Design a binder for this molecule. Sequence first.
Ligand code: ADP
Ligand code: MG
Length: 215
Amino acid sequence: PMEEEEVETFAFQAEIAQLMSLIINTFYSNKEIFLRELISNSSDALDKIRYESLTDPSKLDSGKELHINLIPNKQDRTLTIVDTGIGMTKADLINNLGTIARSGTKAFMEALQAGADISMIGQFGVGFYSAYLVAEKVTVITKHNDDEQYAWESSAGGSFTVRTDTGEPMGRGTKVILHLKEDQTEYLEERRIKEIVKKHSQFIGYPITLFVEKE
Ligand SMILES: Nc1ncnc2c1ncn2[C@@H]1O[C@H](COP(=O)(O)OP(=O)(O)O)[C@@H](O)[C@H]1O
Ligand SMILES: [Mg+2]
């Protein structure tokens, strides 16, 4: 019997859409900082569930281990960053990943126009959008204790979608799936991933593991 799935399409807030266009259509060196930004997000989400669990230990029923996994896939050209952090409810996903204005967005675009390094993006409260330095499409799968599993996705161009995820269940957390641009396949290489984790993400307070498919 044919399955039926609901999709909701949302417009990015106008300056977030302008920032995404600037990130995609301008050459930047130092693109590797995308991974620092996504690991930082995971670390923040791990902190949240860790503290929430102090008030309410049953919040870890959906899984006690607090960690980050990095999964390059050379066959489908994706790099996935998975955490067991707090996750996002549907409302969190729509509000925090594109609809609500970020106070730093205009300042950051001015800084970039004046020649700032793209590394400065996290300081402006818009670090997630660094994924578009290396990815043509991003899919975020997330599960929060309060709610069902959802999938957010965008290829930029001004819009994103949200749907209930019918894929593999996660117990709790977020997976960011980067569909890499053709010229950015270095970020599937185990040596390159280890290099940029060591350079930029050395003080994060949860274990990170890199899973490499046997060649
Ligand atoms: N791995 C994650 N788990 C939970 N929420 C996340 C994740 N990544 C991003 N988010 C949500 O998206 C928001 C935007 O992230 P970002 O653009 O990096 O800004 P910032 O980290 O400065 O808030 C975060 O504040 C958070 O609410
Ligand atoms: Mg961030």
